[PDB]
Design a protein around this ligand. Structure first.
Ligand SMILES: Cc1cc2nc3c(=O)[nH]c(=O)nc-3n(C[C@H](O)[C@H](O)[C@H](O)COP(=O)(O)OP(=O)(O)OC[C@H]3O[C@@H](n4cnc5c(N)ncnc54)[C@H](O)[C@@H]3O)c2cc1C
Ligand SMILES: CCCCCCCCCCCCCCCCCC(=O)O
Ligand SMILES: CCCCCCCCCCCCCCCCCC(=O)O
Length: 563
């Protein structure tokens, strides 16, 4: 009752990160009626705008509340895998960290037309950096806002840098500069506009919500893509939910359907739509339009574990938790006041924006990403501690002061999968992260060796002055087996998730899309989001998504060509 006898030049499934970019650039003439269907609501939550309230988006209405299948290798647990559920997608719920990884990450893709020399200009074109001048690696005129974090914990952040220096790391002054090596300790830039989250809704969709050729439907959950037998022809959605009406939205002659539901829900929606490994599709009774074996497969996420330690009594009150809560658990008015009048203070932080990239075994690129938090975890799952921190508000308790080190396998070797669990298009997908299953034990050894590195750092003079004990894993965890066990029980997602509809050269029987993001054997169906990432780059994945979406956009409208 919303696309009523209206034929669209481009239909966008999902109003996420890449989708926001695409609507902007495709709606930019006047000739292309673009539609955007977003399951979740509009972007208006204050908890999304204030970076520190990331703590309140986890397991919230605005998250998809996805949970993995049982992971036998991880002590038979389910793994919460947070995903944003609103316009802008996970850019509105993410940690705001700005990482491109290294140039080799892209060269390793092997795909023609998408080497590091091909991607670098599309990063720079999307960026306005408050803290680096315009150059080969940084932009000044692009829609994204990037800045150095406007919080500093004067005492713990400096001691982390002194500690890292003590154990032999050297600094890196820009982890996104491909003229020097990726490893090093340093400060991560953040996707923030003076301490407000600068999500892709705010930076791209909001400035164009008035173009008459641009129609944005929130609350609109797509259930399949119409493919008349091969050619996509529309989508089906429901404006209320599982128990509503099954509307349809037709395309114009020449109109394409761009998948933008993310590396979780896109390979899910495609499988419901007829594109996937047939042996899986037959089992639920879905005809096969295209039998591509790579849909669902190659899921790549970056696992994390953590260490935490309290600070000595004499340093009580110098943690970021002390800057956000008072001894009774109410938000400090000084922290509110510095945020609102100046865009400074604890509220601007997601807490994890200083750290390191480390080679644990002389790998070619860093296998380990460290995120240092000047606050103390109280649960060894880091995602839970943030949930816990939110609910800790006004309980009358005092969150103890300490530090945390989150360790991340940033170029992991284990692959996962996204599959069908029900015929119900409103059912949760079958999701298996598959961390720690690479045949060589290499991801587990990255993290185990990360733990030893984090204790060396904590044991340095620089940090031992402040620290007093270790709470996680703790004194009882000495042996490697004991470390490996703790990893298996506390391992959590650093929240990347790429590769489920990966692109590849012609003749790649494993690839789902081609170097122009068109899925094989279907007409007018493209995929532009984190699924197409053939090999996950070293770091958080928001930025490479934006790049991919800019590139795909300028390709569609004939401003650039690939290969
Ligand atoms: C908690 C968290 C922290 C992160 N931190 C960082 C970080 O600090 N820096 C960084 O660079 N990256 C970070 N990431 C990753 C980054 O946010 C994502 O990889 C990136 O935003 C993915 O973009 P996308 O367009 O592929 O997906 P999304 O932005 O998730 O877009 C997919 C969209 O599809 C919608 N959708 C799903 N199913 C349907 C359906 N049936 N019908 C309609 N719409 C549907 C979803 O609601 C969503 O809006 C983080 C991720 C999370 C979850
Ligand atoms: C832990 C997160 C706290 C967020 C507090 C936001 C307060 C905003 C005042 C308006
Ligand atoms: C900024 C928010 C400040 C609150 C920090 C809470 C204190 C514990 C933080 C340690 C968390 C370990 C890393 C977790 C990252 C995943 C979310």
């Amino acid at each position: 009752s919303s696309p009523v006898a209206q034929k669209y030049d481009y239909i966008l499934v999902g109003g996420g990160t890449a989708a926001c970019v695409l609507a902007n650039r495709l709606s930019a003439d006047g000739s292309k009626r673009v539609l955007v269907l977003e399951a979740g609501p509009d972007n208006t939550s204050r908890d999304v705008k204030i970076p520190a309230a990331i703590t309140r988006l986890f397991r919230s209405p605005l998250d998809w509340n996805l949970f993995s299948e049982l992971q036998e290798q991880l002590a038979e647990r389910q793994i919460y895998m947070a995903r944003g559920r609103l316009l802008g997608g996970s850019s509105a719920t993410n940690a705001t960290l700005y990482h491109r990884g290294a140039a080799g990450d892209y060269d390793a893709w092997g795909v023609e037309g998408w080497s590091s020399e091909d991607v670098l200009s599309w990063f720079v074109q999307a960026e306005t950096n408050a803290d680096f001048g315009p150059g080969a690696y940084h932009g000044s005129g692009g829609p994204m806002r990037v800045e150095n974090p406007r919080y500093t914990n004067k005492q713990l952040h400096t001691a982390f840098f002194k500690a890292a220096e003590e154990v032999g790391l050297t600094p890196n002054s820009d982890f996104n500069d491909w003229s020097h090596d990726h490893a090093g300790y340093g400060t991560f830039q953040v996707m923030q506009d003076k301490g407000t989250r600068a999500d892709m809704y705010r930076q791209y969709l909001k400035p164009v919500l008035g173009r008459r050729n641009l129609q944005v439907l929130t609350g609109a959950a797509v259930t399949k893509v119409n493919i008349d037998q091969a050619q996509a022809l529309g989508v089906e959605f429901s404006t209320d939910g599982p128990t509503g009406e099954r509307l349809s939205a037709e395309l114009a002659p020449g109109g394409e359907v761009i998948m933008c539901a993310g590396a979780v829900h896109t390979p899910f929606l495609l499988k419901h739509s007829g594109v996937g490994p047939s042996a899986e599709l037959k089992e639920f009774g879905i005809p096969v339009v295209s039998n591509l074996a790579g849909v669902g497969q190659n899921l790549q996420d970056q696992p994390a574990c953590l260490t935490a330690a309290p600070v000595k009594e004499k340093y009580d009150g110098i943690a970021i938790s002390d800057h956000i809560y008072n001894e009774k658990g109410q938000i400090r008015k000084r922290a509110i006041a510095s945020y609102l009048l100046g865009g400074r203070g604890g509220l601007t932080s997601t807490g994890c924006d200083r750290g390191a990239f480390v080679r644990t075994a002389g790998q070619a690129l860093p296998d380990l990403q460290v995120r240092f938090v000047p606050g103390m975890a109280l649960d060894p799952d880091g995602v839970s501690t943030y949930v816990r921190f939110a609910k800790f508000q006004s309980q009358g308790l005092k969150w103890p002061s300490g530090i945390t080190m989150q360790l991340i396998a940033c170029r992991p070797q284990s692959t996962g999968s996204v599959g069908l669990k029900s015929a119900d298009p409103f059912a949760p997908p079958k999701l298996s992260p598959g961390y720690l299953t690479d045949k060589d034990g290499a991801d587990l050894a990255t993290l185990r060796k990360g733990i030893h590195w984090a204790r060396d750092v904590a044991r340095s003079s620089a940090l031992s002055e402040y620290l007093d004990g270790e709470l996680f894993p703790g004194s009882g965890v000495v042996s490697d087996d004991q470390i490996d066990e703790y990893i298996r029980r506390s391992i959590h997602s650093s929240n990347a998730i790429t590769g489920t509809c990966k692109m590849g050269n012609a003749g790649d029987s494993s690839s789902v899309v081609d170097n122009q993001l068109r899925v094989h054997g279907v007409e007018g169906l493209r995929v532009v989001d984190a699924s197409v990432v053939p090999k996950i780059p070293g770091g958080q994945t928001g930025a490479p998504v934006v790049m991919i979406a800019e590139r795909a956009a300028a390709l569609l409208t004939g401003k650039a060509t690939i290969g």
